Amino acid sequence: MLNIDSIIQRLLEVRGSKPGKNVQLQENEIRGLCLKSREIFLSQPILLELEAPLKICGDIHGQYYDLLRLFEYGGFPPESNYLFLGDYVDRGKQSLETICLLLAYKIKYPENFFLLRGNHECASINRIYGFYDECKRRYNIKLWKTFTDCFNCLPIAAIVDEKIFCCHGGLSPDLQSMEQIRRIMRPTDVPDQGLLCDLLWSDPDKDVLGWGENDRGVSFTFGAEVVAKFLHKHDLDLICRAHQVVEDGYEFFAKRQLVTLFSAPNYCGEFDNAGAMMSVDETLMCSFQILKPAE
Amino acid sequence: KKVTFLEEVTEYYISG
Ligand SMILES: [Mn+2]
Ligand SMILES: [Mn+2]
């Protein structure tokens, strides 16, 4: 039995502190977030059907104080509805605080707050790129395994008002009907290839015609006509995805038929990129707020 | 409905 309000209050009370200040929840509280959110994820569709207005965010990668700023400008739940597109953990310094706040809001406002799976919500990846280390350092191995079982139940994609298709990575040459996504059973790991892999790993590329081998070493690239055909077959207007660092936080592809969102400013302290959040209003007019890193 | 886009982008700076 969670005291979700107590947990959220403690996560938010570090706002305004010198960036880097930790929240040390109890191990049992973090475990509780995982157990309860897993129930909620499994009870909801794996392909979400969402109604605007809402705000959509891309990668966070453990940049907790940047997540707090997103909420400060976007409005704290449930003032605004949110959809996050994955990659909550790794690389940044506070993956635990980040995923704990997101899971806590999912539990408190399960029909106003939504989280998709990214490719870093996968044990084979986040064992290496920082999350496992953070868990072992601050708590224990067992807690990391608990997060893994929770992540294995995240939904994979969302459609906003039957017009905006959202996922972390991108399209799949295997994908012909949305029913294929719906029939993916959870819990599941992410396979090294195939539909689920592509949805979390693939990228648009302006120089490819059709499908190409992705330079990442996983999945594919796809071109602008693949996007156009996808939108026409499924009666969609827009693909909204994340997964790539883009300099202004958002970046259009294929004459605004696809948009990439990335919400971790100055990623890894290397890229000097902005982070963006896309607001979708009830008429599906999309607008962008960006957080630009300054000295 | 139909997706449209606002031309005006809102920018915030994050010092530090
Ligand atoms: Mn990422
Ligand atoms: Mn990614």
Residue numbers in the entry:
A (entry chain A): 6 to 300
B (entry chain B): 639 to 654
Article, verbatim:
Reversible phosphorylation of the alpha subunit of translation initiation factor 2 (eIF2a) is pivotal to control of global rates of protein synthesis and to modulating mRNA-specific translation in eukaryotes. In animal cells, eIF2a phosphorylation is reversed by cellular phosphatase complexes consisting of a protein phosphatase 1 catalytic subunit (PP1) and a substrate-specific regulatory subunit. An RVxF motif, common to many PP1 binding proteins, is present in the conserved functional core of the PPP1R15 family members and their viral counterparts, and plays an important role in assembly of the active holophosphatase complex. Our studies reveal the essential role of a third cellular factor, G-actin, in endowing the complex with substrate specificity and provide the first glimpse at the structure of a ternary holophosphatase complex possessing such substrate specificity.
PPP1R15A and PPP1R15B both formed stable complexes with PP1 (both the PP1A and PP1G isoforms were tested) but crystals suited for structural determination only arose from complexes between human PPP1R15B and mouse PP1G. The PPP1R15B peptide could be traced from K639, immediately N-terminal of the RVxF motif (K640VtF in human PPP1R15B), through to W662. PPP1R15B followed a trajectory along the surface of PP1G similar to that traced by the regulatory subunits spinophilin and PNUTS/PPP1R10. As expected, the side chains of V641 and F643 (of the RVxF motif) engage hydrophobic crevices on the backside of the catalytic subunit, an interaction common to PP1 regulatory subunits. From there PPP1R15B winds its way through the C-terminal groove to the front of the catalytic subunit. Along this path PPP1R15B Y650 occupies a position similar to spinophilin F459 and PNUTS F411 whereas PPP1R15B I652 occupies a position similar to spinophilin T461 and PNUTS F413, whose side chains engage the ϕϕ motif binding-site of PP1. The side chain of PPP1R15B R658 engages a deep pocket on the PP1 surface, occupying the same position as spinophilin R469 and PNUTS R420 and forming a conserved salt bridge with PP1G D71 in the ‘Arg site’, as predicted by Choy and colleagues. The interactions between PPP1R15B and PP1G were thus confined to residues conserved in all PP1 isoforms, explaining the lack of preference of PPP1R15 for binding different PP1 isoforms. Despite their presence in the crystallized proteins, none of the residues C-terminal to W662 could be assigned in the density maps, suggesting that the C-terminal portion of PPP1R15's functional core is disordered in the binary complex. PP1G in these crystals conformed to previous structural determinations of PP1 isoforms (RMS: 0.19–0.29 Å over more than 240 Cα atoms), indicating that the binding of PPP1R15 did not change PP1's structure.
